Amino acid sequence: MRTYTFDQVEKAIEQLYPDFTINTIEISGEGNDCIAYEINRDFIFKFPKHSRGSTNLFNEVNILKRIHNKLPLPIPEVVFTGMPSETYQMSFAGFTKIKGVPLTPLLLNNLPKQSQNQAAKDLARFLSELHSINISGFKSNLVLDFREKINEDNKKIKKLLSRELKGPQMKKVDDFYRDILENEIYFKYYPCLIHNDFSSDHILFDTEKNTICGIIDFGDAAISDPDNDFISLMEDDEEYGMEFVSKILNHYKHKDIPTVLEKYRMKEKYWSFEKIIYGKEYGYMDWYEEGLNEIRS
Numbered sequence: 001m002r003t004y005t006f007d008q009v010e011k012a013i014e015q016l017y018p019d020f021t022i023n024t025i026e027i028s029g030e031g032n033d034c035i036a037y038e039i040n041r042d043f044i045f046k047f048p049k050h051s052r053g054s055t056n057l058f059n060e061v062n063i064l065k066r067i068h069n070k071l072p073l074p075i076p077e078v079v080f081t082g083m084p085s086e087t088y089q090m091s092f093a094g095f096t097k098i099k100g101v102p103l104t105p106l107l108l109n110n111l112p113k114q115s116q117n118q119a120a121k122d123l124a125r126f127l128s129e130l131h132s133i134n135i136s137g138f139k140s141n142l143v144l145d146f147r148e149k150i151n152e153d154n155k156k157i158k159k160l161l162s163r164e165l166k167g168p169q170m171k172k173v174d175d176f177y178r179d180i181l182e183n184e185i186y187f188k189y190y191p192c193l194i195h196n197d198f199s200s201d202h203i204l205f206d207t208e209k210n211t212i213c214g215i216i217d218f219g220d221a222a223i224s225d226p227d228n229d230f231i232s233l234m235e236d237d238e239e240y241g242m243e244f245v246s247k248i249l250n251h252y253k254h255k256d257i258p259t260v261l262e263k264y265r266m267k268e269k270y271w272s273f274e275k276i277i278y279g280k281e282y283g284y285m286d287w288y289e290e291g292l293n294e295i296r297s
């Protein structure tokens, strides 16, 4: 955590944008990586909470400029950029505001069936197009290879938990990693650009028309397994549940649905380990103790 006042936000912005005059500023959201501010009701400026989140913002800015007119839904559009320092790769970025509310599982399920299904269709089309974007211009650094990531998590957990876990417990952790890594189904996919945080909170909805009017938060995007972007929608109360995602899958013409379920299941078990790592790497320490406690069971 770094934290900001309105005067700091304004001065950072005035420095690089001296002719953009500012009336209203108020906090609009706050994520793991950035705080968001609404300026003149027409712009959302993200300011990083730490270096990690700044690097996330920098990556978001860059992917958006590559895909800005390639999708069938609106996406955030970058209008203002800050600067790199020794602490942040980018001090802030200002985006066009997208009107709408999050498409919560509550909101979704109270829609008439016809809108519900059109939502599934519109999401499938957004994903099918996103996953078909040609990635060849893209920086090779965006490639998230899932085998390497898992091998790397195993060593980070070992390094982190070696003094915290009893020998037999750490053996069982090594067992779970070995087991995941021997199953080829997690690691044979054709990589493509994926949103990689595709969930109900990043899907915006227009309640006058009852249709999806935007997709937001591209800070996690990578070139990786297209199946990541369904599994993040599958969790029953938290997200949409299986019946809805299966409609999305059918529109997307997915060919190996039992593969997605399998990755979903493993992902959900994998959450405890993500809570430990992601706790420390995002220095949020109640996740850490929680994951560790789940692991000791």
Ligand SMILES: NC[C@H]1O[C@H](O[C@H]2[C@H](O)[C@@H](O[C@H]3O[C@H](CO)[C@@H](O)[C@H](N)[C@H]3O)[C@H](N)C[C@@H]2N)[C@H](O)[C@@H](O)[C@@H]1O
Residues within 6 Å of the ligand: 032, 196, 197, 199, 201, 220, 232, 235, 238, 239, 268, 271
């Ligand atoms: N109790 C909260 C839930 O949290 C996880 O999922 C949630 C993600 O954590 C959120 O996002 C953050 O974590 C992501 C991992 O995907 C990263 O991409 C990103 N840096 C972060 O912004 C996402 N928007 C909503 C989603 N429901 C678990 O899977 C789930 O079991 C658990 O119930």
